[PDB]
Structures are given as C-alpha cells and as structure tokens.
C-alpha cells in the first residue's frame, strides 16, 4: 500500500441481535479501522463516499471509501497522522488533517497532493481538534505553551493537568493566507473550540477539566475576542458535557446531570437569547450528535459492558428508540483511547447511523439502518 493505492472491501450485512435492524460492516475486523470524530464532515454531500482511518499500510492513515464500488483509496501515508480530527471540505474536494501534531495539512482529493496550511510554532503545542467555519476559509483550535504541555496519555494525567493552569490560546487560522490570530489567551485549560455553523462571529469553547470542578463548562466568544460569556450558570451539583452545535447553527446542544441522581438530560441553548431549555431525558451515553436541523439525535450507550445500545431521539415526537447494538468493548488499541468509541452520526439521508465498534475483533466501521418506527 501507499498514497493513491486502492483496496477492495467486502461489505458484510446482517441483522442486529437485539433489534433486528439491518447492519452492514464496511471494513475487515482483522485490520484496525475507525470513523472520524462525529462532529467533523466524513461523508461527501451526496452520501456516496466516506472518509475513515485504517491500518492497512501499517500505521493509521486516511482512506476514502466509495460506498457504491466498495473500493477504498489510501489518501495519506506515513507514521504521524491524526486520523480522528480530519474533515472533508464543503465542496468534497479536499481533506484537512493534522500531521505530526503540528502541521495542518490540506490534501487535494483529485491529485492527492498535500500542502501545509499552518504550522503550530516551536514554543507551542497543538491541543485537540481544529474546526473550520462553514465556508471552510478559517479554522479555530487550541495551542498550549510547550513549557506547560505534557503528553496526556492516561486519565490520571488528564485529571492532574487541569490543576496546573496551563497557558492556552484560542487561535484562528486563515486557510488562504495561513495567517494566525489569537482570539483569547488565559492561564486555564481551554478546549473544543467550534465555529457556530453559518455564523463566523460566534465561537463556542470549553473550560476543560473534571466535570464537577470546572467553574463552567461552556463558553461563547466573538470572533474578534470580545464578549466572552458563559452559555449558562451551572446549578448546584450540575455537570454539563457533550456540547455540540446543531449543524444548521440554530442551537448549542449539551447533556446535563446532577450529583445525587443518575438521570441525564438533553438541553438546548439559544446562542442569541442564552435561554437554556430541557428537551428530554436520555440513557447515559458517551457522546451525542444530531442530524442537520436537530430533529433527530443519536447517542452511544456508555460503559460502566453496561449499555451496548445505540439510541435515536426523535425530537419532534419526544420519542426514544433503541435502534441497534454498538457492542464496543471501549478497550484501548495501540495507546488510543478514542479508537473504540462508537461516535455515532447520521448519514446525509438520515436513514442510517455510522459508528465504530470492535465487536468482531479490531475496530471496524458499521452502518445501522434506522427502523421505520423512528418516524412511526
Ligand atoms: Ca507501503
Ligand atoms: Ca436564536
Ligand atoms: Mn469519544
């Protein structure tokens, strides 16, 4: 294998053991393959091609899978790809991803030629995922001062890091010029910056750290650095997590729970009004994602083997649907703590959900067909 090489994949279709839903496995479970982060574009607009990470060449690299032809083309090569943060451009003509922790790359999908768009400078370390605006002309991301950075290779390191008050800057990068601007810089752990879809003037970001210790999880700031404000004031004992933009940019959605009760709730916040509203209760899930207008949501039942199910929430109906099993082990493969995360999202047609599981050996990609009962 190498950049540009093609491999044919077998698609194995069966019925879910619990729900009877049609499920198709897309990748062979003797090779580690996984989907990207759920909020990053991986399907082309017409739903015919799919970006994923695979280990066929040895390390984990990007591939584009033609879902009609069942051929995967290797997009990137070498040992330093972050195969989770990558996304397709709006026009389906480019892949953006980070190589060697520092180099934000653009890959031309026709030629497979790469260009380095931006390099995190020497005195800083890129943290987390770079996220584009809807126009795909700008990126936001976090850089942490090298002096303050440590490799966060386990959950104890991740826990302790919060108390060090690392110097973090929220960067915005121009994709055409490669120029960078600091939006915000503070001595506290900043994370998950995400442009509001169709509103470049609004950037959401978090205070990373233990859920029950952070002053407030969710923040908004204007693109120019002005008007930094919290999305909500946490009630006593309240944790807020799993925040994401509805892809149409209508609302910020998140999960809320209170110390003393296991119950989880989906909430929505209006970005202009900052009214936060409780939408529905949910089973404990590890992630949450919606379709384009937030009329459907999907979540992956959490580890304690506790809950092997994928749930779909019909937000028009207020109904909840146990649609299929993910059956992931949640185990670490090759040091990576995200690789077995199901990370469900909807196909562009809203008929299927895409997720990772290692149920059949190594991590693989699956598509589960939503039952007619989701829409009654
Ligand atoms: Ca090779
Ligand atoms: Ca509004
Ligand atoms: Mn995850």
């Amino acid at each position: 294998m190498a950049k540009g090489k093609q491999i044919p994949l077998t698609f194995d279709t069966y019925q879910d053991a619990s729900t009877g839903a049609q499920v198709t496995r897309l990748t062979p479970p003797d090779v580690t393959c996984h989907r990207n982060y759920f909020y990053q574009k991986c399907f082309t607009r017409d739903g015919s091609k799919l970006l994923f990470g695979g280990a066929f060449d040895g390390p984990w690299n990007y591939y584009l899978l033609d879902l009609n032809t069942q051929v995967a083309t290797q997009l990137t090569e070498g040992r330093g790809d972050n195969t989770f943060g990558g996304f397709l451009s709006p026009d389906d003509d480019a892949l953006f991803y980070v190589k060697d922790g520092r180099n934000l790359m653009r890959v031309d999908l026709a030629t497979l030629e790469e260009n380095v768009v931006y390099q995190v400078p020497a005195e800083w370390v890129g943290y987390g995922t770079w996220v584009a605006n809807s126009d795909c002309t700008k990126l936001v991301g976090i850089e942490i001062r090298r002096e303050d950075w440590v490799p966060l290779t386990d959950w104890k390191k991740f826990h302790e890091f919060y108390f060090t008050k690392p110097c973090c800057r929220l960067m915005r990068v121009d994709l055409k010029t490669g120029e960078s601007t600091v939006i915000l810089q503070e001595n506290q752990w900043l994370g998950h910056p995400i442009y509001r879809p169709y509103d470049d003037s609004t950037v959401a970001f978090c205070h990373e750290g233990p859920h029950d210790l952070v002053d407030a999880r969710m923040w908004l700031i204007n693109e120019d650095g002005t008007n930094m404000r919290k999305v909500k004031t946490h009630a006593e004992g309240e944790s807020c997590t799993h925040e994401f933009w509805v892809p149409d940019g209508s609302a910020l959605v998140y999960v809320s729970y209170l110390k003393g009760s296991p119950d989880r709730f989906i909430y929505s916040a209006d970005p202009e009004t900052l009214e936060n509203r409780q939408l529905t209760s949910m089973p404990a899930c590890s992630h949450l994602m919606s379709n384009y207008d937030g009329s459907l949501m999907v979540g992956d039942g959490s580890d304690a083997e506790n809950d092997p199910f994928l749930y779909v929430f019909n937000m028009k109906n207020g109904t909840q649907h146990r649609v299929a099993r993910h059956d992931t082990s949640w185990k670490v493969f090759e040091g990576d703590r995200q690789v077995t995360h199901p990370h469900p999202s909807f196909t562009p047609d809203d008929k299927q959900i895409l997720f990772t599981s290692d149920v059949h050996g190594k991590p693989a990609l699956y598509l589960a067909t939503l039952p007619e009962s989701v829409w009654k």
Side-chain angles (χ1 to χ4, degrees), residues 115-153:
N115 183 61
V116 16
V117 173
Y118 171 78
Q119 179 173 93
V120 179
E123 286 193 58
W124 299 85
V125 185
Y127 172 77
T129 303
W130 293 83
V131 169
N133 66 337
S134 294
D135 286 337
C136 202
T137 59
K138 290 173 281 189
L139 298 179
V140 284
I142 302 300
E143 294 174 1
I144 302 188
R145 196 183 296 286
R146 180 178 296 284
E147 247 203 315
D148 291 346
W149 176 247
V150 302
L152 297 174
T153 60

mmCIF file of all heavy atoms in Angstrom, residues 115-153:
data_model
loop_
_atom_site.group_PDB
_atom_site.id
_atom_site.type_symbol
_atom_site.label_atom_id
_atom_site.label_comp_id
_atom_site.label_asym_id
_atom_site.label_seq_id
_atom_site.Cartn_x
_atom_site.Cartn_y
_atom_site.Cartn_z
ATOM 1 N N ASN A 115 -0.523 20.193 0.925
ATOM 2 C CA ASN A 115 0.091 21.479 1.234
ATOM 3 C C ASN A 115 0.006 21.709 2.734
ATOM 4 O O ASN A 115 -1.042 21.448 3.348
ATOM 5 C CB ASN A 115 -0.669 22.595 0.493
ATOM 6 C CG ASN A 115 -0.058 23.954 0.698
ATOM 7 O OD1 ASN A 115 1.106 24.191 0.338
ATOM 8 N ND2 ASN A 115 -0.837 24.877 1.263
ATOM 9 N N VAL A 116 1.078 22.202 3.350
ATOM 10 C CA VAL A 116 0.931 22.595 4.750
ATOM 11 C C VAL A 116 0.339 24.000 4.853
ATOM 12 O O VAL A 116 0.918 24.981 4.375
ATOM 13 C CB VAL A 116 2.199 22.304 5.661
ATOM 14 C CG1 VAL A 116 3.417 22.047 4.870
ATOM 15 C CG2 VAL A 116 2.373 23.348 6.783
ATOM 16 N N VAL A 117 -0.851 24.077 5.436
ATOM 17 C CA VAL A 117 -1.571 25.338 5.502
ATOM 18 C C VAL A 117 -1.062 26.182 6.667
ATOM 19 O O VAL A 117 -0.915 27.405 6.545
ATOM 20 C CB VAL A 117 -3.101 25.113 5.616
ATOM 21 C CG1 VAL A 117 -3.809 26.423 5.859
ATOM 22 C CG2 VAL A 117 -3.640 24.434 4.349
ATOM 23 N N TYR A 118 -0.789 25.531 7.796
ATOM 24 C CA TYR A 118 -0.348 26.234 9.001
ATOM 25 C C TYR A 118 0.479 25.280 9.839
ATOM 26 O O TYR A 118 0.149 24.091 9.919
ATOM 27 C CB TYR A 118 -1.549 26.751 9.824
ATOM 28 C CG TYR A 118 -1.209 27.312 11.197
ATOM 29 C CD1 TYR A 118 -0.675 28.603 11.340
ATOM 30 C CD2 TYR A 118 -1.438 26.563 12.357
ATOM 31 C CE1 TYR A 118 -0.377 29.129 12.616
ATOM 32 C CE2 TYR A 118 -1.143 27.067 13.620
ATOM 33 C CZ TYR A 118 -0.603 28.343 13.753
ATOM 34 O OH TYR A 118 -0.316 28.847 15.014
ATOM 35 N N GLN A 119 1.549 25.802 10.446
ATOM 36 C CA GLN A 119 2.346 25.031 11.393
ATOM 37 C C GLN A 119 2.300 25.672 12.777
ATOM 38 O O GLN A 119 2.598 26.866 12.937
ATOM 39 C CB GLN A 119 3.797 24.910 10.918
ATOM 40 C CG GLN A 119 4.681 24.128 11.874
ATOM 41 C CD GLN A 119 6.056 23.875 11.316
ATOM 42 O OE1 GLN A 119 6.979 24.645 11.559
ATOM 43 N NE2 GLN A 119 6.201 22.806 10.550
ATOM 44 N N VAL A 120 1.936 24.882 13.786
ATOM 45 C CA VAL A 120 1.979 25.360 15.154
ATOM 46 C C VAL A 120 3.442 25.725 15.441
ATOM 47 O O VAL A 120 4.334 24.905 15.196
ATOM 48 C CB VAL A 120 1.478 24.293 16.149
ATOM 49 C CG1 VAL A 120 1.562 24.806 17.589
ATOM 50 C CG2 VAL A 120 0.018 23.869 15.799
ATOM 51 N N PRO A 121 3.688 26.963 15.900
ATOM 52 C CA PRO A 121 5.093 27.382 16.089
ATOM 53 C C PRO A 121 5.788 26.652 17.248
ATOM 54 O O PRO A 121 5.120 26.055 18.094
ATOM 55 C CB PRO A 121 5.003 28.906 16.299
ATOM 56 C CG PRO A 121 3.588 29.195 16.659
ATOM 57 C CD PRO A 121 2.725 28.053 16.165
ATOM 58 N N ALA A 122 7.124 26.711 17.253
ATOM 59 C CA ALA A 122 8.004 25.943 18.158
ATOM 60 C C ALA A 122 7.669 25.949 19.643
ATOM 61 O O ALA A 122 7.802 24.916 20.312
ATOM 62 C CB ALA A 122 9.469 26.419 17.984
ATOM 63 N N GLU A 123 7.274 27.112 20.152
ATOM 64 C CA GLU A 123 7.089 27.318 21.591
ATOM 65 C C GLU A 123 5.720 26.867 22.089
ATOM 66 O O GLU A 123 5.385 27.070 23.254
ATOM 67 C CB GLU A 123 7.253 28.804 21.923
ATOM 68 C CG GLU A 123 8.694 29.320 21.897
ATOM 69 C CD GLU A 123 8.825 30.707 22.536
ATOM 70 O OE1 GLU A 123 8.452 30.862 23.728
ATOM 71 O OE2 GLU A 123 9.307 31.638 21.852
ATOM 72 N N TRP A 124 4.943 26.271 21.190
ATOM 73 C CA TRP A 124 3.562 25.882 21.456
ATOM 74 C C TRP A 124 3.304 24.457 20.964
ATOM 75 O O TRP A 124 4.044 23.932 20.127
ATOM 76 C CB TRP A 124 2.596 26.865 20.777
ATOM 77 C CG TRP A 124 2.747 28.281 21.288
ATOM 78 C CD1 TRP A 124 3.645 29.209 20.858
ATOM 79 C CD2 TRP A 124 1.987 28.901 22.326
ATOM 80 N NE1 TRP A 124 3.499 30.375 21.566
ATOM 81 C CE2 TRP A 124 2.490 30.214 22.481
ATOM 82 C CE3 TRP A 124 0.929 28.480 23.137
ATOM 83 C CZ2 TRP A 124 1.960 31.114 23.403
ATOM 84 C CZ3 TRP A 124 0.407 29.366 24.079
ATOM 85 C CH2 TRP A 124 0.931 30.677 24.208
ATOM 86 N N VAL A 125 2.256 23.845 21.513
ATOM 87 C CA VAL A 125 1.811 22.504 21.132
ATOM 88 C C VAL A 125 0.309 22.570 20.810
ATOM 89 O O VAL A 125 -0.485 23.066 21.617
ATOM 90 C CB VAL A 125 2.051 21.470 22.265
ATOM 91 C CG1 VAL A 125 1.691 20.062 21.798
ATOM 92 C CG2 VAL A 125 3.496 21.517 22.758
ATOM 93 N N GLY A 126 -0.062 22.064 19.636
ATOM 94 C CA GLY A 126 -1.478 21.963 19.275
ATOM 95 C C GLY A 126 -2.195 21.024 20.238
ATOM 96 O O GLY A 126 -1.680 19.957 20.581
ATOM 97 N N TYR A 127 -3.376 21.438 20.687
ATOM 98 C CA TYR A 127 -4.218 20.628 21.557
ATOM 99 C C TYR A 127 -5.606 20.435 20.955
ATOM 100 O O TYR A 127 -6.271 21.395 20.581
ATOM 101 C CB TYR A 127 -4.339 21.220 22.965
ATOM 102 C CG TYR A 127 -5.360 20.479 23.800
ATOM 103 C CD1 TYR A 127 -5.056 19.231 24.359
ATOM 104 C CD2 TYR A 127 -6.652 20.989 23.985
ATOM 105 C CE1 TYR A 127 -6.008 18.525 25.100
ATOM 106 C CE2 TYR A 127 -7.611 20.287 24.733
ATOM 107 C CZ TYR A 127 -7.277 19.064 25.284
ATOM 108 O OH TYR A 127 -8.213 18.370 25.996
ATOM 109 N N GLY A 128 -6.035 19.184 20.868
ATOM 110 C CA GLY A 128 -7.366 18.855 20.340
ATOM 111 C C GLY A 128 -7.519 19.054 18.840
ATOM 112 O O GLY A 128 -6.542 19.002 18.072
ATOM 113 N N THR A 129 -8.763 19.293 18.423
ATOM 114 C CA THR A 129 -9.146 19.243 17.018
ATOM 115 C C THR A 129 -9.332 20.657 16.448
ATOM 116 O O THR A 129 -9.945 21.492 17.086
ATOM 117 C CB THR A 129 -10.454 18.431 16.858
ATOM 118 O OG1 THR A 129 -10.255 17.109 17.405
ATOM 119 C CG2 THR A 129 -10.838 18.291 15.397
ATOM 120 N N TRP A 130 -8.786 20.899 15.263
ATOM 121 C CA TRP A 130 -9.021 22.169 14.551
ATOM 122 C C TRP A 130 -10.360 22.071 13.827
ATOM 123 O O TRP A 130 -10.634 21.055 13.160
ATOM 124 C CB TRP A 130 -7.893 22.426 13.552
ATOM 125 C CG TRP A 130 -6.598 22.675 14.226
ATOM 126 C CD1 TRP A 130 -5.720 21.738 14.685
ATOM 127 C CD2 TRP A 130 -6.035 23.953 14.555
ATOM 128 N NE1 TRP A 130 -4.630 22.354 15.277
ATOM 129 C CE2 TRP A 130 -4.802 23.714 15.209
ATOM 130 C CE3 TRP A 130 -6.455 25.276 14.367
ATOM 131 C CZ2 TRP A 130 -3.974 24.757 15.662
ATOM 132 C CZ3 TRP A 130 -5.634 26.315 14.827
ATOM 133 C CH2 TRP A 130 -4.408 26.047 15.461
ATOM 134 N N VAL A 131 -11.194 23.112 13.938
ATOM 135 C CA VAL A 131 -12.559 23.053 13.371
ATOM 136 C C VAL A 131 -12.768 24.230 12.428
ATOM 137 O O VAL A 131 -12.450 25.362 12.776
ATOM 138 C CB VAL A 131 -13.636 23.076 14.498
ATOM 139 C CG1 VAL A 131 -15.057 23.295 13.925
ATOM 140 C CG2 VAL A 131 -13.573 21.785 15.298
ATOM 141 N N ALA A 132 -13.301 23.952 11.239
ATOM 142 C CA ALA A 132 -13.485 25.007 10.237
ATOM 143 C C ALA A 132 -14.802 25.740 10.408
ATOM 144 O O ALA A 132 -15.748 25.233 11.011
ATOM 145 C CB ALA A 132 -13.384 24.431 8.828
ATOM 146 N N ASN A 133 -14.849 26.956 9.868
ATOM 147 C CA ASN A 133 -16.119 27.641 9.662
ATOM 148 C C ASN A 133 -16.899 26.998 8.500
ATOM 149 O O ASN A 133 -16.365 26.173 7.760
ATOM 150 C CB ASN A 133 -15.864 29.142 9.431
ATOM 151 C CG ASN A 133 -15.114 29.429 8.127
ATOM 152 O OD1 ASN A 133 -14.426 28.578 7.586
ATOM 153 N ND2 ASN A 133 -15.269 30.646 7.619
ATOM 154 N N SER A 134 -18.174 27.347 8.352
ATOM 155 C CA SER A 134 -18.998 26.705 7.328
ATOM 156 C C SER A 134 -18.460 26.922 5.916
ATOM 157 O O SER A 134 -18.529 26.023 5.073
ATOM 158 C CB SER A 134 -20.441 27.191 7.429
ATOM 159 O OG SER A 134 -21.027 26.759 8.645
ATOM 160 N N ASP A 135 -17.909 28.119 5.676
ATOM 161 C CA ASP A 135 -17.317 28.465 4.391
ATOM 162 C C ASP A 135 -15.985 27.751 4.088
ATOM 163 O O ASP A 135 -15.511 27.755 2.944
ATOM 164 C CB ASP A 135 -17.160 29.988 4.277
ATOM 165 C CG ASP A 135 -18.491 30.696 4.038
ATOM 166 O OD1 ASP A 135 -19.438 30.050 3.542
ATOM 167 O OD2 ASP A 135 -18.581 31.905 4.338
ATOM 168 N N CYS A 136 -15.402 27.146 5.122
ATOM 169 C CA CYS A 136 -14.091 26.477 5.060
ATOM 170 C C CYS A 136 -13.017 27.453 4.561
ATOM 171 O O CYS A 136 -12.277 27.159 3.616
ATOM 172 C CB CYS A 136 -14.155 25.185 4.235
ATOM 173 S SG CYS A 136 -12.830 24.014 4.631
ATOM 174 N N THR A 137 -12.974 28.619 5.208
ATOM 175 C CA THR A 137 -11.961 29.635 4.928
ATOM 176 C C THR A 137 -11.108 29.954 6.148
ATOM 177 O O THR A 137 -10.045 30.595 6.018
ATOM 178 C CB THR A 137 -12.597 30.952 4.391
ATOM 179 O OG1 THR A 137 -13.534 31.477 5.353
ATOM 180 C CG2 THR A 137 -13.263 30.729 3.050
ATOM 181 N N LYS A 138 -11.567 29.506 7.324
ATOM 182 C CA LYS A 138 -10.911 29.764 8.617
ATOM 183 C C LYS A 138 -11.016 28.529 9.520
ATOM 184 O O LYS A 138 -11.939 27.740 9.370
ATOM 185 C CB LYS A 138 -11.548 30.951 9.346
ATOM 186 C CG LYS A 138 -11.279 32.322 8.691
ATOM 187 C CD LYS A 138 -12.071 33.420 9.362
ATOM 188 C CE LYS A 138 -13.509 33.399 8.883
ATOM 189 N NZ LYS A 138 -14.295 34.595 9.339
ATOM 190 N N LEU A 139 -10.061 28.385 10.440
ATOM 191 C CA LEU A 139 -10.076 27.317 11.452
ATOM 192 C C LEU A 139 -9.923 27.907 12.834
ATOM 193 O O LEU A 139 -9.258 28.935 13.003
ATOM 194 C CB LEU A 139 -8.890 26.376 11.254
ATOM 195 C CG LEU A 139 -8.675 25.543 10.006
ATOM 196 C CD1 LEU A 139 -7.367 24.785 10.207
ATOM 197 C CD2 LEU A 139 -9.819 24.572 9.773
ATOM 198 N N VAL A 140 -10.552 27.273 13.824
ATOM 199 C CA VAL A 140 -10.227 27.545 15.225
ATOM 200 C C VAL A 140 -9.605 26.301 15.870
ATOM 201 O O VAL A 140 -9.943 25.168 15.519
ATOM 202 C CB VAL A 140 -11.416 28.063 16.072
ATOM 203 C CG1 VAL A 140 -11.690 29.540 15.747
ATOM 204 C CG2 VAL A 140 -12.684 27.217 15.877
ATOM 205 N N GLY A 141 -8.682 26.540 16.804
ATOM 206 C CA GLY A 141 -8.021 25.455 17.536
ATOM 207 C C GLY A 141 -7.314 25.991 18.760
ATOM 208 O O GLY A 141 -7.202 27.204 18.934
ATOM 209 N N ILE A 142 -6.815 25.089 19.602
ATOM 210 C CA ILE A 142 -6.110 25.472 20.823
ATOM 211 C C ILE A 142 -4.623 25.176 20.688
ATOM 212 O O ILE A 142 -4.246 24.141 20.176
ATOM 213 C CB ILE A 142 -6.653 24.712 22.063
ATOM 214 C CG1 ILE A 142 -8.156 24.966 22.261
ATOM 215 C CG2 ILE A 142 -5.885 25.086 23.344
ATOM 216 C CD1 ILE A 142 -8.541 26.421 22.468
ATOM 217 N N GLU A 143 -3.793 26.111 21.139
ATOM 218 C CA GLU A 143 -2.361 25.857 21.314
ATOM 219 C C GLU A 143 -1.991 26.080 22.769
ATOM 220 O O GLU A 143 -2.482 27.013 23.415
ATOM 221 C CB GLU A 143 -1.533 26.774 20.409
ATOM 222 C CG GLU A 143 -1.725 26.477 18.916
ATOM 223 C CD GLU A 143 -1.029 27.469 18.015
ATOM 224 O OE1 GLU A 143 -0.357 28.402 18.532
ATOM 225 O OE2 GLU A 143 -1.143 27.289 16.785
ATOM 226 N N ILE A 144 -1.140 25.205 23.297
ATOM 227 C CA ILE A 144 -0.737 25.271 24.704
ATOM 228 C C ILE A 144 0.763 25.539 24.744
ATOM 229 O O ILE A 144 1.509 24.985 23.938
ATOM 230 C CB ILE A 144 -1.067 23.950 25.450
ATOM 231 C CG1 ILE A 144 -2.578 23.656 25.338
ATOM 232 C CG2 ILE A 144 -0.566 24.001 26.916
ATOM 233 C CD1 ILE A 144 -3.111 22.466 26.184
ATOM 234 N N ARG A 145 1.198 26.414 25.644
ATOM 235 C CA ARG A 145 2.616 26.739 25.708
ATOM 236 C C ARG A 145 3.390 25.456 25.998
ATOM 237 O O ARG A 145 2.992 24.680 26.862
ATOM 238 C CB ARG A 145 2.890 27.803 26.777
ATOM 239 C CG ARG A 145 4.251 28.441 26.612
ATOM 240 C CD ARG A 145 4.563 29.455 27.708
ATOM 241 N NE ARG A 145 3.664 30.608 27.688
ATOM 242 C CZ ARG A 145 3.706 31.597 26.792
ATOM 243 N NH1 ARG A 145 4.605 31.600 25.814
ATOM 244 N NH2 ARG A 145 2.844 32.605 26.882
ATOM 245 N N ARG A 146 4.474 25.233 25.260
ATOM 246 C CA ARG A 146 5.251 23.987 25.399
ATOM 247 C C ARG A 146 5.668 23.721 26.849
ATOM 248 O O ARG A 146 5.607 22.582 27.322
ATOM 249 C CB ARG A 146 6.492 23.999 24.499
ATOM 250 C CG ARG A 146 7.322 22.707 24.612
ATOM 251 C CD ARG A 146 8.513 22.701 23.682
ATOM 252 N NE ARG A 146 8.097 22.729 22.285
ATOM 253 C CZ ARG A 146 7.603 21.693 21.615
ATOM 254 N NH1 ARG A 146 7.436 20.515 22.203
ATOM 255 N NH2 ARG A 146 7.258 21.848 20.344
ATOM 256 N N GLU A 147 6.120 24.774 27.534
ATOM 257 C CA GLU A 147 6.512 24.708 28.946
ATOM 258 C C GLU A 147 5.431 24.119 29.831
ATOM 259 O O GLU A 147 5.727 23.479 30.855
ATOM 260 C CB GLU A 147 6.808 26.115 29.468
ATOM 261 C CG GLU A 147 8.230 26.408 29.833
ATOM 262 C CD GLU A 147 8.289 27.556 30.833
ATOM 263 O OE1 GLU A 147 7.573 28.563 30.603
ATOM 264 O OE2 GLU A 147 9.011 27.437 31.861
ATOM 265 N N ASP A 148 4.179 24.363 29.446
ATOM 266 C CA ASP A 148 3.016 23.946 30.223
ATOM 267 C C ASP A 148 2.415 22.636 29.722
ATOM 268 O O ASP A 148 1.554 22.063 30.388
ATOM 269 C CB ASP A 148 1.933 25.023 30.163
ATOM 270 C CG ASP A 148 2.317 26.279 30.904
ATOM 271 O OD1 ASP A 148 3.300 26.237 31.688
ATOM 272 O OD2 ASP A 148 1.625 27.309 30.723
ATOM 273 N N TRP A 149 2.856 22.171 28.558
ATOM 274 C CA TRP A 149 2.288 20.966 27.969
ATOM 275 C C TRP A 149 2.947 19.703 28.494
ATOM 276 O O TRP A 149 4.165 19.668 28.683
ATOM 277 C CB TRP A 149 2.397 20.991 26.441
ATOM 278 C CG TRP A 149 1.911 19.710 25.807
ATOM 279 C CD1 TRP A 149 2.667 18.774 25.137
ATOM 280 C CD2 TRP A 149 0.571 19.205 25.821
ATOM 281 N NE1 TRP A 149 1.867 17.738 24.719
ATOM 282 C CE2 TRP A 149 0.578 17.977 25.117
ATOM 283 C CE3 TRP A 149 -0.638 19.669 26.365
ATOM 284 C CZ2 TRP A 149 -0.576 17.199 24.948
ATOM 285 C CZ3 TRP A 149 -1.792 18.898 26.184
ATOM 286 C CH2 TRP A 149 -1.749 17.675 25.485
ATOM 287 N N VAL A 150 2.127 18.683 28.740
ATOM 288 C CA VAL A 150 2.603 17.325 28.985
ATOM 289 C C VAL A 150 1.730 16.374 28.145
ATOM 290 O O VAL A 150 0.548 16.659 27.926
ATOM 291 C CB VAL A 150 2.536 16.937 30.482
ATOM 292 C CG1 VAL A 150 3.350 17.912 31.347
ATOM 293 C CG2 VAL A 150 1.097 16.860 30.973
ATOM 294 N N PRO A 151 2.305 15.244 27.670
ATOM 295 C CA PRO A 151 1.508 14.249 26.948
ATOM 296 C C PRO A 151 0.410 13.660 27.843
ATOM 297 O O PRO A 151 0.694 13.185 28.947
ATOM 298 C CB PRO A 151 2.539 13.161 26.578
ATOM 299 C CG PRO A 151 3.857 13.808 26.672
ATOM 300 C CD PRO A 151 3.742 14.899 27.699
ATOM 301 N N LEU A 152 -0.843 13.719 27.389
ATOM 302 C CA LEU A 152 -1.958 13.303 28.240
ATOM 303 C C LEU A 152 -2.365 11.885 27.878
ATOM 304 O O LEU A 152 -3.437 11.645 27.286
ATOM 305 C CB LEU A 152 -3.124 14.280 28.091
ATOM 306 C CG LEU A 152 -2.798 15.709 28.564
ATOM 307 C CD1 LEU A 152 -3.961 16.669 28.259
ATOM 308 C CD2 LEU A 152 -2.430 15.749 30.053
ATOM 309 N N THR A 153 -1.493 10.947 28.239
ATOM 310 C CA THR A 153 -1.579 9.585 27.706
ATOM 311 C C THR A 153 -2.460 8.644 28.525
ATOM 312 O O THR A 153 -2.711 7.506 28.109
ATOM 313 C CB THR A 153 -0.187 8.959 27.540
ATOM 314 O OG1 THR A 153 0.458 8.911 28.817
ATOM 315 C CG2 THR A 153 0.658 9.769 26.535
#
